[PDB]
Amino acid sequence: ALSLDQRIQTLAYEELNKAVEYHQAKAGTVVVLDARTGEILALANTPGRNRAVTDMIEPGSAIKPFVIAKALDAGKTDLNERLNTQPYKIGPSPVRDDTHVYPSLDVRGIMQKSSNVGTSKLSARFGAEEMYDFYHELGIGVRMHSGFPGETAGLLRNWRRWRPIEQATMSFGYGLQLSLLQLARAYTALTHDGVLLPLSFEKQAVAPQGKRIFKESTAREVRNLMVSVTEPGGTGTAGAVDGFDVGAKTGTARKLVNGRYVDNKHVGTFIGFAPAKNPRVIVAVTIDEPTAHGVVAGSPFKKIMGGSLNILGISPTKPLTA
């Protein structure tokens, strides 16, 4: 009684190969979760090791929704505040959006434009220790004990050694590491009404008691705000799925490789869930070091998500246009 769905696995495998070949990338990974149970429905890798499981990545933009959720959850911001989002400095260190300037944005805007400034200022309303604990409770630095070879814990540095610049760069996804599976896992906290799920490779007749991280209503509102990422105006319109509202993030993630000098490998990333309001599927795609022609992880995400929803009998919630 494995949780894996062949129809979805075949679809994940095929769109992944297609995308990796088209972009001439080194490698690729897809994870598909049942957004309500945490069942792994698919897990596809290009040939070689199980990167979904073994490869620590710095998540980039994909971590942002969590910072924003924490800030809404604690009442440190709300849906009406306009933040000053001008580039600014911490000590010598510039913080900037890439590479637009947005003078001000509300929280929806911060999500929509995936703003580094807005995110890092929402993070800065918490102490280093509170943020550390938050990242830890998302499972960052905590082994999943999947039972696969090469698995590791990840990296969350002790908060006592954090500089204010490091707290801020962690809020936009650098200086801490987790696997794609750990990242897809964190997303269940958003889809399953504030409750983080442990994930399982086996079919579930429960489904499991997870661990509350956010209020239900915080998760519900964050999902709505993530819809603006895939709509016109957002940074992830490449991951829009006809007929559905999709909540998602795109970004370039990083993979570190030792040793003489550490190699910063770039990884195209797209992660999301749909239907946004009542999610049924989380899809996460990474594509390692694309070379030709971020639509990179977006198109296969778009195809895998669309195809998974059809396979599972989930109907569109809005009109089709083309």
Query: Which tokens is 88 given?
Result: 């600014």
Query: Which tokens is 287 given?
Result: 């594509």
For residue 254, the one-letter residue type is R
Query: Which tokens is 291 given?
Result: 């070379």
Experimental method: X-ray
Sign of CA dihedral 50, 172, 214, 153: positive
> Which of 216, 138, 221 is closest to 181 using CA atoms?
138
Deposited resolution, Å: 2.2
* Domain covering 1-322: architecture: 3-Layer(aba) Sandwich (3.40)
Tokens 């979805």 correspond to 8
- Max Cα distance, the chain (Å): 56
The torsion of the CA quartet 201, 216, 68, 12, rounded to 10 degrees, works out to 30
Under 8 Å between Cβ of 273 and 314: no
What is d(CA 303, CA 305) in angstroms, rounded to the nearest whole number?
5
> Which stretches of the chain are DSSP H helices?
6-22, 51-54, 64-73, 107-112, 116-123, 128-137, 164-171, 180-186, 188-191, 216-230, 295-311
Mutual angle of helices 64-73 and 116-123, in 10-degree steps: 40
Q: How far is CA 75 from CA 69, 113, 134, 214, in A?
A: 10, 22, 15, 12
> Residue 269: is the preceding peptide bond cis (ω within 30°)?
no
Q: Which residues are identified as catalytic?
A: 61
CA angle 256, 69, 131 (to 5 degrees): 55
Residue spans per domain, the chain: 1-322
Tokens 């993030």 correspond to 249
Q: How far is CA 247 from CA 4, 121, 281, 293, 315, in A?
A: 23, 22, 11, 25, 17
